[PDB]
C-alpha cells in the first residue's frame, strides 16, 4: 500500500522515512473506514454492477457472442462475466491499498499477453472496463465515486497503452 | 515486501474473494494504529544514534567482546558492529511501520546467519545488543509503541538463532 | 552446443581417428535429413505463437491451474507461463535443427528444475503443456518431422522430471 | 558446423532462424557427398601425402634436422611427422564441418602458445602447413581442390597472424 | 608490510616484481635491527610515556576530566590511559612493519564512528597522541626519533581529516 | 595476505601484546633471509618461461596427457595448462618473497580443486609438474633459496591433493 511505497523509497535512500512521507502515512491511514465502505458496498452489489455492465457491453459488442466471436456460447460468455467479478474485486483492493499496485501485480502486468493469446479483444477489454466503472459509480456517493473512479480509470488507461 | 493492508488483501486473493468481515477487522486494527505507528517512527528516527549508543554501552561495552580476541576489538571491527545495529533499528522501524515482518525476511535475516558464522561474528552478543536496543527504545517510545517495535526487534534475533 | 556434424567430429577426434564408416553413415543421414529439418524450422517459426496457444487451450485452460491458487492464477504468472512455453518450442526447434540434443542440456534445463522447485512452478503441468506442444506441432508439421521434434521436447519433459 | 552458427546467432537474437538463414543450411547440407568424399580421399593417402610434405619441408629448412634444431633425431622428426597427420585430419573434420571451428577449437586456439613452448619455429610451422595443401590438393579433382584450399589457408593465415 | 605492498601491486598487474620494487623490498630488510630496538625501547618504556602524555594531555584540557567530560572518574580515566597504551603498541608495529597498514587497520579505520560513540571528542583524541609523540620521541636517538616520527604523524593527520 | 611480519604483529595484536622476545627472533629471522629471498626472485623472474617449459618436458610430455583423450590434448588445453603453471611459479614466488603462505590459500586454492573437478583436470599430473618446477627451480636458484620455494610449491600441491 502507501505504507509500503514509502518504506521502499526510504531504503532505497538508507534512510528513515521523512516528516513528510509520515505525515502522508498518517492522513491515509485516517481514511480507512471510508475505503471499506466503499469496498463492502462494490462487493455487496457485485452480481448487479457485472449485469448492468455486460448488458451495455454486448449491446455495444454483440459480435462478441456471435459466431467466431470469442464471447460465443455460454462457457465463453459466463467466462467473460467471471472475468468481470475478477476485476471489481481488484479495484475495491486498490481502493482498500490506496494504490494501484493490487491491480496491477494481480491483473495488469502481462494482461495484454494473456488476452491475446485467449483471442479476446483488448480494446474489447477497455470497453468492458469503461461500462463497469459506470455501473460500480452509479451505486457509489458522488464523494466515494470520485474516490473510487482513478482506480478503474488506471486499468482503462493501462489496456489501451503498449 | 507487504505491509499488514497488502498481507490481508493476498490472502484474500489466493483465494478469489473480497475481503470478508474478520479481514476488515485486522485492516480496521491497522488503520487506527496509524498514529502510533507515525510518532514511534519520528521519535526513533530523530533519535537513532543515542539509541544504538545506550544499547551498546548497556551490553557490550567493558566486556570480552571489545578486548583482543574478542569480534569488537579494533576500530574497524567497532564500527562495523555499530553499522549493523543501525540497520537492525531502521529495519525493524520500517516493519512496526508496516505492520508486518517480510521486509525483515526479504532485506535483513536473507543469508545474514551464514554470513555471520562464515566471518565469525558473535551470535549471542549480538542478540544481546538487539534485546538492548529493545529496551531502550522502549524506554523513549512508550509502552504500547514499545510492544510493536519489541516484536520486530524480537524477529530480527529469533531469526539469527 | 553442438549439432549432429561437431557430435560426430568430437567422438573421432577424442580417439585421434579420421571418420571411418560407421561415423560417415551418420553423416550422410543427418545431410539427408536437410529437407525435412529446413521446412520444419520454417512451419514452426510461422506457427509459433499459434502452436502455444493452443498447447494452452488443451492442456491447462479451465482447470485448477488458472484459478486462485494455481500456478498461472494472475496475469503476470500467465504471462510468464507463456513466454516459458515459447522458450521450449523455440530451443526444441534448434535441438531439431541441429540433430543434437546438446543445446538443450546447455541452455535449458541447466538448474531450471531447481528455479522451479524454489518459485513453486508445478513440474506436472508444465511436462503436460510441453507433451500437448508436442502434439499440436506434429499436427502441422506432419508424422516424420513431428517424430524429430517430439524426441527434443520429450527431452526436455525428461530433464524436468 | 554451418548449422550450429546459425542456431547461435538466433539464439543471441531470441528469435527463429531467417528463411535466408535456413536456405544457407539446407544448400549446405546438400553438399555433404562431396565432404565425405574428399575426406576419405586425404585419409586414405594421408601416409602419401605426409611424405610428400615433410620431403619439401626439411629440403628448405634442413637445419631443423641439424644438431640444435627442433626436429633433430629420430624421435623427434617423428613427432613432427605425427603433428602432420593431426593436421590433415583437422583440415578433413573442416571440409566436413563446412566451417573452421574444428580446426580453431583443436588445432589452432594456442597454438603459438603451444609451439613456442615447445621450440617449435611458428614459421615452420607455417611453411609445413603450406607444402602439406600443396601435397593434398594434389590428390583431389579441380573442383575438390578448391573446395579444400580456404582450410589449409585458414591454417596457413592463423600460424602467419597475431 | 614493505613486501606485501609489492606482492599486491605486483599481483595487480599479473607480473613479477621489477628489479625496482626488489630494490626496495632489500633496503627494507636490512633496516630490521633498527626497527627492533625502536619498537622494543617504546615497549619497555610505556608506563612512563604514557604518564609523561596523560600529564601533558589533561593539563591542557582539564574539562575532560571534571563533571560532564568523558574521561570523568577513575574506571573512565583509566580506560583513556588503557588506549593510549594501545596508540603506542600500533606505533611499534608501524615502525616494524615499515608501513602504517598495522596502525590503520586496527586503531584508524572507523576510528572517528567508534569515538563518536562513545562520545569522546575526536580533537581531544589529536591532541592525545601529539603529546604521545612528544613523549616516546624524547626517549629516542636523534635518528630514531626521524624514524618513528612518520608513524604518530600518520595517526594524528588521520584523526585530523574527514 | 599476510607477510611473515605481519603474521608475527597478527598473532600480538590479537594478545593485546608488544612483540616478545620470541616473536623478535621471528622477525630477525626474516630480516636476515632478505637476500636470499630477492635474489631468488630477480633468478625466477627471469627464466620463469624456461622453468615451466623444463618442467613440462620432464613430467608431461611424450605421455598419455597430451595424447587424445588426455587432458592436454587440443592446443586450446595445451595453452591453458601452461597457463596454470605460469600462475603457480608465480604465485610460489610471492609467497617466497613474503615467507609467507596466506597469499596462497587467498588467491590460488580458494575453489580451485572444485574447479578442476568440475572440468576433468587431472590432479595426479598437475601435482607431477608442479613438483617438477620445484625441482627445476632448485637446479637454479640453488639449495637454500630451492627449499623456502619448495615449501611454497610444495604448499599449493598439499591444497590440491
Ligand atoms: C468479458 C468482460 C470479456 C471476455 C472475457 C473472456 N475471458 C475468457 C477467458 C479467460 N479469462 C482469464 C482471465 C484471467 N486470469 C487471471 O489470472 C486474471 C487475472 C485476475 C484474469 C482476468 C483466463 C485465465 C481465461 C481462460 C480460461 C480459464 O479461466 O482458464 C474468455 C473465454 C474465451 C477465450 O478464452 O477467448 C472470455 C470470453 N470476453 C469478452 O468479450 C469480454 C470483453
Ligand atoms: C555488533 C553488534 C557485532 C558485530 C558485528 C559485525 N558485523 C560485521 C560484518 C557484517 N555485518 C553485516 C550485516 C549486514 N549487512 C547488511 O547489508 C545487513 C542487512 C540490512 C546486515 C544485517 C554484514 C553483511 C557484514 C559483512 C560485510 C561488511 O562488513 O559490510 C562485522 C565485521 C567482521 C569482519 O571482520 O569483517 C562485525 C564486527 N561484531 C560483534 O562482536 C558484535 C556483537
Ligand atoms: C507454464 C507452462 C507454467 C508456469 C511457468 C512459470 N514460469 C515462471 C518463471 C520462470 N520460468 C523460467 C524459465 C526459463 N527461463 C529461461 O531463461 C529459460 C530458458 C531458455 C527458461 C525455461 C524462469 C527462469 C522463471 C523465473 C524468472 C522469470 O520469471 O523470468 C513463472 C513465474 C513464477 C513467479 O511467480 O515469479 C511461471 C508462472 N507456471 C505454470 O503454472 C505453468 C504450468
Ligand atoms: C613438423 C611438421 C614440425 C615439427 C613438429 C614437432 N612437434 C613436436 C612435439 C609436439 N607436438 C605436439 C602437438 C600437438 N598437440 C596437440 O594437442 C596438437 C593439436 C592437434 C598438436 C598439433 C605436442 C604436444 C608435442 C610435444 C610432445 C608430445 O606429443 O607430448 C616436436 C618434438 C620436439 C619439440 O618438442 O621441439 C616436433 C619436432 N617440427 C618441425 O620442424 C616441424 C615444422
Ligand atoms: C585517552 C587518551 C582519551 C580518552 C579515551 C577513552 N576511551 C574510552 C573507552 C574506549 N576506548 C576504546 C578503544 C578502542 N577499541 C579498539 O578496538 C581500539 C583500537 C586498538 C581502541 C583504541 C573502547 C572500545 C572503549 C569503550 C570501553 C571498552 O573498552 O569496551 C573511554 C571511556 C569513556 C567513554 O567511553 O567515553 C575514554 C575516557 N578519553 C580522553 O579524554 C582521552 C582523549
Ligand atoms: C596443466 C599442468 C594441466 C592442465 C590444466 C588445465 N587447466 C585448465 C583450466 C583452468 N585452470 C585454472 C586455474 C587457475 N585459474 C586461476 O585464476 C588460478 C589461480 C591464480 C588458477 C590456478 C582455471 C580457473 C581454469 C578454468 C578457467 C580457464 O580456463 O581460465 C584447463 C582447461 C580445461 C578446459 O577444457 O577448459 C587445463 C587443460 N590440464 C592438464 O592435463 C594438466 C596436467
Known amino acids: ?162 | 515486501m507487504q505491509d499488514a493492508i497488502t498481507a490481508v488483501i493476498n490472502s484474500a486473493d489466493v483465494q478469489g474473494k473480497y475481503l470478508d468481515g474478520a479481514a476488515m477487522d485486522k485492516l480496521k486494527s491497522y488503520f487506527a494504529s496509524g498514529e502510533l505507528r507515525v510518532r514511534a517512527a519520528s521519535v526513533i528516527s530523530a533519535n537513532a544514534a543515542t539509541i544504538v549508543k545506550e544499547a551498546v554501552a548497556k551490553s557490550l561495552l567493558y566486556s570480552d567482546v571489545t578486548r583482543p580476541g574478542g569480534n569488537m576489538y579494533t576500530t574497524r571491527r567497532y564500527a562495523a558492529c555499530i553499522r549493523d545495529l543501525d540497520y537492525y533499528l531502521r529495519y525493524a522501524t520500517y516493519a512496526m511501520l508496516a505492520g508486518d515482518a517480510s521486509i525483515l525476511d526479504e532485506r535483513v535475516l536473507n543469508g545474514l546467519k551464514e554470513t555471520y558464522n562464515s566471518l565469525g561474528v558473535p551470535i549471542s552478543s549480538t542478540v544481546q545488543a538487539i534485546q538492548a536496543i529493545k529496551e531502550v527504545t522502549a524506554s523513549l517510545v512508550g509502552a504500547d509503541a514499545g510492544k510493536e517495535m519489541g516484536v520486530y526487534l524480537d524477529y530480527i534475533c529469533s531469526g539469527l538463532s
Chains 1, 4, 5 share one sequence.
Not at chain 1, 538508507?14 to 466503499?38: D, N, V, W
Open chain 1, 1 to 162: 500500500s502507501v505504507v509500503s511505497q514509502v518504506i521502499l523509497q526510504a531504503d532505497d535512500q538508507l534512510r528513515y522515512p521523512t516528516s513528510g512521507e509520515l505525515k502522508g502515512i498518517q492522513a491515509f491511514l485516517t481514511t480507512g473506514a471510508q475505503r471499506i465502505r466503499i469496498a463492502e458496498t462494490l462487493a455487496e452489489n457485485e452480481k448487479k454492477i457485472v449485469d448492468q455492465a455486460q448488458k451495455q457491453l454486448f449491446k455495444k459488442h454483440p459480435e462478441y457472442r456471435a459466431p467466431g466471436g470469442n464471447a460465443y456460447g455460454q462457457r465463453q460468455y459466463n467466462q467473460c462475466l467471471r472475468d468481470y467479478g475478477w476485476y471489481l474485486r481488484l479495484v475495491t483492493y486498490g481502493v482498500l491499498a490506496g494504490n494501484k499496485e493490487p491491480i496491477e501485480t494481480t491483473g495488469l502486468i502481462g494482461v495484454k499477453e494473456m488476452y491475446n493469446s485467449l483471442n479476446v479483444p483488448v480494446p474489447g477489454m477497455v470497453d468492458a472496463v469503461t461500462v463497469l466503472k459506470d455501473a460500480a459509480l452509479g451505486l457509489l456517493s458522488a464523494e466515494d465515486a470520485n474516490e473510487t473512479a482513478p482506480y478503474f480509470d488506471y486499468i482503462i488507461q493501462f489496456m489501451s497503452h503498449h
